[PDB]
């Protein structure tokens, strides 16, 4: 009943996300190799065929838009993921939307670490590997909202979670009971309570030697809330100073507050 729960969440995660941390760690290590993107030339080569939108303006903004395309696809998967949780789908549709609105970016940044290492991150289903040196090389606004994700991603991967753990972690992130405008708060805190109790139970079997892992994850959850807050501010500034830069409508609604 409680392991049936974690098993169900683990299947929805497997079923709804094309890139898992298992696949990702296979590619980064070398089981099988992706095409390295580290400057204008290699990005263009990847943009043709090889690896793979508004009109191309500059490099820093071109990456920005690719970030948005990736964000939009993950938001699609996370929506199907949340819906595959029967308890979730039983909330009223407007509560479902409030949960996703304030949850996806936290979840997205949590899952980013699965496809990241100290040197770069996988893109397009793992066919390419954008380097961190390149992303530091971008213009001053756009190179700022990427580096913190690495800093978080490296400290998150230090915990050595696997996909079975992450499925519950993400589910816990989405079913947050203190999201602004939630209609039926107690029902959401109840589901969240089941998820965390399932997560803590699962961490015992899967990580028998992990000292203080569950409380640490809960700390990572709060750290993600802060990363998203800081990420959102840079985005708003980008909206203000980069008046010629676009924002995909779906992302406009999420941040609309």
Ligand X SMILES: CCO[C@H](COc1ccc(C(F)(F)F)cc1)CSc1ccc(OCC(=O)O)c(C)c1
Among 6, 42, 74, 114, interactor with ligand X by CB under 6 A: 74
Measured from the CB of residue 23, what is the shortest distance to ligand X in angstroms? 16
CB nearer ligand X, residue 3 or residue 76: 76
Instruction: Measure the CA–CA gap between 124 and 186, rounded to whole angstroms.
Output: 39
Q: How far is the CB of 150 from ligand X (least distance, A)?
A: 9
* C-alpha closest to that of 67 among 253, 226, 254, 251: 251
CA distances from 185 to 91, 124, 179, 195 (A): 10, 37, 9, 16
- Residue in the block written with tokens 């996703």: 100
Does 173 help bind ligand X (rule: CB under 6 A)?
no
Rule CB under 6 A: say whether 19 interacts with ligand X.
no
Position among 91, 99, 145, 213 found at the interface with ligand X (CB under 6 A): 145
3-state secondary structure of 84: coil
- Coil, strand, or helix at residue 131? strand
**Minimum distance from residue 135 beta carbon to ligand X (Å):** 6
Among residues 168, 176, 213, 235, the one that binds ligand X under rule CB under 6 A? 235
Comparison of 9 and 123: residue with beta carbon closer to ligand X: 123
Among 27, 37, 176, 191, binds ligand X (CB under 6 A): 37
Identity of the residue, 114 or 164, whose beta carbon is nearer to ligand X in the bound complex: 114
**Which long-range CB contacts under 8 A does 152-157 form with residues at least 24 apart?**
152/109, 152/113, 152/223, 152/224, 152/227, 153/109, 153/112, 153/113, 153/116, 153/121, 154/113, 154/116, 154/117, 154/118, 156/110, 156/113, 156/220, 157/113, 157/116, 157/117
Cβ atoms of 237 and 247 closer than 8 Å: no
Residue 31 vs 256, nearer CB to ligand X:
256
* Nearer to ligand X (CB atom), residue 135 or residue 176: 135
Burial class (CB in 10 A: 0-12, 13-18, 19+), 62: buried
Judged by beta carbon, residue 43 or residue 166, the one nearer ligand X is 43
Residues in 77-136 at the binding interface with ligand X, rule: CB under 6 A = 108, 112, 121, 123, 130, 135
Which residue of this chain has its Cβ atom nearest to ligand X in the complex? 66
Nearer to ligand X among residue 121 and residue 191 (C-beta): 121
Residues that bind ligand X (CB under 6 A): 37, 43, 63-64, 66-68, 70-71, 74, 108, 112, 121, 123, 130, 135, 145-146, 149, 235, 251
């Amino acid at each position: 009943d409680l392991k049936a729960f974690s098993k169900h969440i683990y299947n929805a995660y497997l079923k709804n996300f094309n890139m898992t941390k298992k696949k990702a760690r296979s590619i980064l290590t070398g089981k099988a190799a992706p095409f390295v993107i580290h400057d204008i030339e290699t990005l263009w080569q990847a943009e043709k065929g090889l690896v793979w939108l508004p009109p191309y303006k500059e490099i820093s903004v071109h990456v920005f838009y690719r970030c948005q395309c990736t964000t939009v696809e993950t938001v699609r998967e996370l929506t199907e993921f949340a819906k595959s949780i029967p308890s979730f789908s039983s909330l009223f549709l407007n509560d479902q939307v409030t949960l996703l609105k304030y949850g996806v970016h936290e979840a997205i940044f949590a899952m980013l670490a699965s496809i990241v290492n100290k040197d770069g991150l996988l893109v397009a289903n793992g066919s390419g590997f954008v380097t961190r040196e390149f992303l530091r090389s971008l213009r001053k606004p756009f190179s700022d909202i990427i580096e913190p994700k690495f800093e978080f991603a490296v400290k998150f991967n230090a915990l050595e979670l696997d996909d079975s753990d992450l499925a519950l972690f993400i589910a816990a992130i989405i079913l947050c009971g203190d999201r602004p405008g939630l209609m039926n708060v107690p029902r959401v805190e109840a589901i969240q309570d089941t998820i965390l109790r399932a997560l803590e139970f699962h961490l015992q079997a899967n990580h028998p030697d992990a000292q203080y892992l569950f409380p640490k994850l809960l700390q990572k959850m709060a750290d993600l809330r802060q990363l998203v807050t800081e990420h959102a501010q840079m985005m708003q500034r980008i909206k203000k100073t980069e008046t010629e830069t676009s924002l995909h409508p779906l992302l406009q609604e999420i941040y609309k507050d």
